[PDB]
Design a protein around this ligand. Sequence first.
Ligand SMILES: COc1ccc(N(C(=O)Nc2c(C)cccc2C)c2cc(Nc3ccc(N4CCN(C)CC4)cc3)ncn2)c(OC)c1
Length: 318
Amino acid sequence: RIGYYEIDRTIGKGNFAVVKRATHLVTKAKVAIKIIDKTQLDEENLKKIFREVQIMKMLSHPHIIRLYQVMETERMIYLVTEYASGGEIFDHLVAHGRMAEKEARRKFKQIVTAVYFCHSRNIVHRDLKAENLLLDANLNIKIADFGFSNLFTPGQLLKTWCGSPPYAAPELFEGKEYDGPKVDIWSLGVVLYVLVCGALPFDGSTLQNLRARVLSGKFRIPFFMSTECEHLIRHMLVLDPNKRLSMEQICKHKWMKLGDADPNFDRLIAESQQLKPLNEDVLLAMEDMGLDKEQTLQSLRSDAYDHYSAIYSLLCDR
Ligand SMILES: COc1ccc(N(C(=O)Nc2c(C)cccc2C)c2cc(Nc3ccc(N4CCN(C)CC4)cc3)ncn2)c(OC)c1
């Protein structure tokens, strides 16, 4: 037990972190808690985790994992998030293999909504990979690991070479300054390919081999891949960043449009395209628990991600 949380499973173990499932003992919500030992952490790694957390706080969206609370001790950091009860896409692909385009379109449309929203808030992910995508109880997408993400100014070039080589755009291998979104659009091309094909478009027995594959820009279209799907991927996996589809063009592609109507997609993409409240009954419910409404409002106003913020948010998403 950790504050208001009862831990009931360990689901992750990597980096300097362990992730557990927990239950919030007031709201009954299932959460994931990532526990980071700072006594393992290097100086720049702490500056990384700090930026990761700051970016996650900027992102409230249906297809992005939601951060609810930060707890910090002298020794440990605790990050409490929405729990994705479907697991990772990796395990789904191991279990069931390459997805039918019907399935791939549903999920990719959800991925695109999430990434488009990041861009609308001047965030680039810069590490989009299929395998690490999370799934909720209905196998709906939630995008996670923002460990390589950053703020960008539209038009500005970035100069940190990051992410996983199989998903990395050629200009990242080449050590060029890069447009943030165009890097994400390349990664999206590889993720779409993986979902439909169950394999990577660019691969190799060494990183040197793989690097040459990416810079070549050639990949195999399998017999089972539709003409429309092929066209989408080929318009994302273009060597010149400037000849890649925009996010706006990706949403409009004919592969997206065929199949069942999709009001949520269009609504979410519309919301991301915009330029320009307090729930009183939540505040009252909290007050009747024994949380003073003054400290709750202070916690909310300061963007604290503390005990009171968590409970406010967890109740509102219920
Ligand atoms: C796989 O390795 C992990 C393990 C855990 C997380 N994880 C976070 O780390 N979240 C997070 C937190 C807490 C804080 C900060 C940032 C982030 C990103 C997380 C997973 C999750 N659902 C879920 C359930 C079960 C399974 N599998 C069950 C079957 N397999 C045998 C074992 C694994 C995978 C995922 N729901 C929410 N968060 C993760 O995210 C990429 C990958």
